[PDB]
Design an enzyme around this catalytic site. Structure first.
Site, mmCIF file in Angstrom:
data_model
loop_
_atom_site.group_PDB
_atom_site.id
_atom_site.type_symbol
_atom_site.label_atom_id
_atom_site.label_comp_id
_atom_site.label_asym_id
_atom_site.label_seq_id
_atom_site.Cartn_x
_atom_site.Cartn_y
_atom_site.Cartn_z
ATOM 1 N N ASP A 1 -21.902 -16.772 35.488
ATOM 2 C CA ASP A 1 -20.938 -17.876 35.580
ATOM 3 C C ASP A 1 -21.063 -18.602 36.920
ATOM 4 O OD1 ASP A 1 -19.812 -17.264 32.987
ATOM 5 O OD2 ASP A 1 -18.144 -16.164 33.858
ATOM 6 N N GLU B 1 -5.952 -18.020 26.606
ATOM 7 C CA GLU B 1 -5.699 -17.781 25.195
ATOM 8 C C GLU B 1 -4.613 -16.723 25.042
ATOM 9 O OE1 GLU B 1 -9.811 -16.944 24.337
ATOM 10 O OE2 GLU B 1 -10.081 -19.022 23.605
ATOM 11 N N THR C 1 -10.117 -23.047 17.412
ATOM 12 C CA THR C 1 -11.503 -23.159 17.830
ATOM 13 C C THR C 1 -12.385 -22.764 16.660
ATOM 14 O OG1 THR C 1 -13.025 -22.521 19.616
ATOM 15 C CG2 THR C 1 -11.445 -20.831 18.855
ATOM 16 N N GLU D 1 -11.027 -27.034 18.783
ATOM 17 C CA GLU D 1 -12.170 -27.143 19.678
ATOM 18 C C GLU D 1 -13.403 -26.576 18.962
ATOM 19 O OE1 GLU D 1 -9.504 -26.803 23.711
ATOM 20 O OE2 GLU D 1 -10.864 -25.086 23.232
ATOM 21 N N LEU E 1 -18.741 -22.933 20.656
ATOM 22 C CA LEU E 1 -20.015 -22.834 21.353
ATOM 23 C C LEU E 1 -20.601 -24.240 21.565
ATOM 24 C CD1 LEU E 1 -21.577 -19.768 19.441
ATOM 25 C CD2 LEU E 1 -20.608 -19.809 21.819
HETATM 26 C C1 LIG Z 1 -17.948 -14.081 22.840
HETATM 27 C C2 LIG Z 1 -18.644 -15.002 21.832
HETATM 28 O O1 LIG Z 1 -19.557 -14.179 21.076
HETATM 29 C C3 LIG Z 1 -20.315 -14.841 20.102
HETATM 30 O O2 LIG Z 1 -21.167 -15.828 20.703
HETATM 31 C C4 LIG Z 1 -22.539 -15.497 20.804
HETATM 32 C C5 LIG Z 1 -23.340 -16.508 19.980
HETATM 33 O O3 LIG Z 1 -23.124 -16.362 18.569
HETATM 34 C C6 LIG Z 1 -24.819 -16.397 20.293
HETATM 35 O O4 LIG Z 1 -25.545 -17.411 19.563
HETATM 36 C C7 LIG Z 1 -25.000 -16.606 21.779
HETATM 37 O O5 LIG Z 1 -24.504 -17.889 22.142
HETATM 38 C C8 LIG Z 1 -25.305 -18.694 23.024
HETATM 39 C C9 LIG Z 1 -25.554 -19.977 22.229
HETATM 40 O O6 LIG Z 1 -26.272 -19.702 21.011
HETATM 41 C C10 LIG Z 1 -26.317 -20.979 23.089
HETATM 42 O O7 LIG Z 1 -26.493 -22.180 22.329
HETATM 43 C C11 LIG Z 1 -25.524 -21.260 24.364
HETATM 44 O O8 LIG Z 1 -26.195 -22.282 25.129
HETATM 45 O O9 LIG Z 1 -25.364 -20.017 25.094
HETATM 46 C C12 LIG Z 1 -24.572 -19.070 24.327
HETATM 47 C C13 LIG Z 1 -24.168 -17.890 25.217
HETATM 48 O O10 LIG Z 1 -25.259 -17.014 25.560
HETATM 49 O O11 LIG Z 1 -24.284 -15.573 22.483
HETATM 50 C C14 LIG Z 1 -22.853 -15.589 22.297
HETATM 51 C C15 LIG Z 1 -22.272 -14.423 23.114
HETATM 52 O O12 LIG Z 1 -22.752 -13.145 22.639
HETATM 53 C C16 LIG Z 1 -19.408 -15.565 19.118
HETATM 54 O O13 LIG Z 1 -20.210 -16.175 18.110
HETATM 55 C C17 LIG Z 1 -18.482 -16.562 19.829
HETATM 56 O O14 LIG Z 1 -17.656 -17.198 18.848
HETATM 57 C C18 LIG Z 1 -17.698 -15.768 20.859
HETATM 58 N N1 LIG Z 1 -16.725 -16.607 21.547
HETATM 59 C C19 LIG Z 1 -15.365 -16.109 21.700
HETATM 60 C C20 LIG Z 1 -14.876 -16.240 23.116
HETATM 61 C C21 LIG Z 1 -13.815 -16.951 23.501
HETATM 62 C C22 LIG Z 1 -13.338 -16.844 24.930
HETATM 63 O O15 LIG Z 1 -12.130 -16.071 24.930
HETATM 64 C C23 LIG Z 1 -13.053 -17.782 22.527
HETATM 65 O O16 LIG Z 1 -12.717 -19.027 23.150
HETATM 66 C C24 LIG Z 1 -13.855 -18.063 21.259
HETATM 67 O O17 LIG Z 1 -13.041 -18.673 20.268
HETATM 68 C C25 LIG Z 1 -14.364 -16.740 20.725
HETATM 69 O O18 LIG Z 1 -14.991 -16.920 19.450
#
Ligand SMILES: C[C@H]1O[C@H](O[C@H]2[C@H](O)[C@@H](O)[C@@H](O[C@H]3[C@H](O)[C@@H](O)[C@H](O)O[C@@H]3CO)O[C@@H]2CO)[C@H](O)[C@@H](O)[C@@H]1N[C@H]1C=C(CO)[C@@H](O)[C@H](O)[C@H]1O
Length: 486
Positions: A96, A181, A337, A375, A378
């Site tokens: 971060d 949240e 979201t 929102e 990702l």
């Molecule tokens: C915590 C988070 O976990 C999951 O997200 C994954 C993605 O599915 C995976 O593809 C990868 O994401 C990367 C993305 O593809 C890329 O384009 C971007 O530039 O970088 C991303 C980060 O590395 O990795 C993440 C993390 O393992 C879920 O699919 C997400 O929905 C999930 N988000 C959470 C977190 C929060 C914060 O409290 C909420 O706001 C959100 O609603 C919740 O879903």
């Protein structure tokens, strides 16, 4: 006449809109980016108003200088503004770039009282937010956490009164936990969880333990304890006796614990929203909360990750309509979201159903008469993502002669950057905004707000929980938008 179809679009500002030193130092870059958003017809922007920046010196030593400079820039761009009361840490995960803790003087209390922090079954303290267990405990140089939140919002209102009166600030989103949240920190990504682990219950601080003991005693079970068959962060449900199919989550004790855990979140939101409503009484603003999108394990019976986040959601129990019922007296809105996600984009092993979760939450809000916004979860720049957002924004498509039966009150895009406003990314975004506006120009007068009325009568947890059952099917959603980007 298609005007009633218009959905406002907001864009979240960078996490660094105000520097980590509480100075506004990127005004010229932001002004240039905002020109691109105005060229695209955007309704407004949204920003985190960081507690750790503004009340960093000491109690009540509020320094609003940088935020007032930012707000003036946004006003001079002709944009509206959604303000988040950000009572949580920015960043702190591996990689971060922007790291802003809650105030140091607040954290100092944790040296003699580490139970001010949500704590897991290992004893690990999460330092991003104050446990709901200290909402009403006068631990912080005589103030409780709720008093600190109320006092911050009061100072915000006093300082930002001109922007309120001018119709610049139109929404106040009240942060209610980590990441702003209304949730527990059940998926600690830099500290022992990786997606799609089930997460953990984060109820071991001494204030929450004493609250559970009292709740259990009031129902004649003083001996009950938190479940001890719940595995750990990176388990899957079948690794555990609690969350497995036909597991102990179904038992009397399991139900009692899950109700207690999720009810505490609801009570936390109710008490803080009551204070926010008193602060903003009479101003032409929407008050909102943010619900996290816990889509992993939604396809399995236990909904394990929702449970550990604090959303007591099962096949036969609507864990979001209860939240929505609590919001109703405040006339508060839900900001959700995952609006850009398709189920087919998720990994199979995550047992993930973001589309169905979105439909459930929107339908719950609408049944309780709430405004609902969303929102993207990702970063996405592609037409398919925009078309998925468009579907969710108007689930029944365009009504040709009046307002549709259901529609989002707004959408906020995460997040402004230089990459968004150039090239093909910008072309895709501008067309998205056109479509969200039903191919109409920006309407600066859209969705006017009445002066905020006082919250209605406080209702009991039992009254709120009447919304849990029977669980109703969602309203019908079209598979694809009728007004795609092209
Ligand atoms: C915590 C988070 O976990 C999951 O997200 C994954 C993605 O599915 C995976 O593809 C990868 O994401 C990367 C993305 O593809 C890329 O384009 C971007 O530039 O970088 C991303 C980060 O590395 O990795 C993440 C993390 O393992 C879920 O699919 C997400 O929905 C999930 N988000 C959470 C977190 C929060 C914060 O409290 C909420 O706001 C959100 O609603 C919740 O879903």
């Amino acid at each position: 006449n298609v005007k009633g179809n218009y959905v406002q679009v907001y864009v979240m500002l960078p996490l660094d809109a105000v520097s980590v030193n509480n100075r506004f130092e990127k005004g010229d870059e932001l002004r240039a980016q905002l020109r691109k958003l105005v060229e695209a017809g955007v309704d407004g922007v949204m920003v985190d108003v960081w507690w750790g920046l503004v009340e960093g010196k000491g109690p009540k030593a509020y320094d609003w200088s940088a935020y007032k400079q930012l707000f003036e820039l946004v006003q001079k761009a002709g944009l509206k503004l959604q303000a988040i009361m950000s009572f949580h840490q920015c960043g702190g995960n591996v990689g971060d770039a922007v790291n802003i803790p809650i105030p140091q003087w607040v954290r100092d209390v944790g040296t003699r009282d580490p139970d001010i922090f949500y704590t897991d079954g290992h004893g690990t303290r999460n330092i991003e937010y104050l446990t709901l267990g200290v909402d009403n405990q006068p631990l912080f140089h005589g103030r409780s956490a709720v008093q600190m939140y109320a006092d911050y919002m009061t100072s915000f209102r006093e300082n930002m009164k001109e922007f309120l009166d001018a119709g610049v600030i139109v929404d106040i989103e009240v942060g209610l936990g980590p990441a702003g949240e209304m949730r527990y920190p059940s998926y600690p990504q830099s500290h022992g969880w990786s997606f799609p682990g089930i997460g953990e219950f984060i109820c071991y601080d001494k204030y929450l333990q004493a609250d559970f003991k009292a709740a259990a005693a009031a129902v004649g079970h003083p001996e009950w304890e938190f479940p001890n068959d719940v595995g750990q962060y990176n388990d899957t449900p079948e690794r555990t006796q609690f969350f497995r199919d036909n597991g102990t989550y179904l038992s009397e004790k399991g139900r009692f614990f899950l109700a207690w855990y999720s009810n505490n979140l609801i009570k936390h939101g109710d008490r803080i929203l009551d204070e926010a409503n008193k602060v903003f009484l009479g101003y032409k603003v929407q008050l909102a909360i943010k619900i996290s999108g816990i889509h992993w394990w939604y396809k399995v019976p236990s909904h394990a990750a929702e449970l550990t986040a604090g959303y007591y959601n099962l096949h036969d129990r609507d864990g979001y309509r209860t939240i929505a019922r609590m919001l109703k007296r405040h006339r508060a809105s839900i900001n959700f979201t995952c609006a850009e996600m398709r189920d087919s984009e998720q990994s199979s092993q995550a047992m993930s159903a973001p589309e169905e979760l979105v439909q459930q939450v929107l339908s719950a809000g609408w049944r309780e008469g709430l405004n609902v916004a969303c929102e993207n979860a990702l970063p996405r720049y592609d037409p398919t993502a925009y078309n998925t957002i468009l579907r969710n924004a108007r689930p029944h498509g365009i009504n040709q002669s009046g307002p549709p039966e259901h529609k989002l009150f707004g959408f906020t895009y995460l997040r402004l950057s230089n990459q968004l406003v150039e090239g093909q990314n910008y072309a895709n975004f501008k067309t998205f905004v056109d479509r969200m506006h039903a191919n109409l120009p920006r309407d600066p007068y859209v969705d006017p707000m009445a002066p905020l009325p006082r919250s209605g009568p406080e209702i009991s947890i039992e009254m709120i929980l009447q919304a849990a059952q029977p669980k109703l099917q969602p309203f019908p959603f079209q598979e694809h938008t009728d007004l795609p980007v092209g």
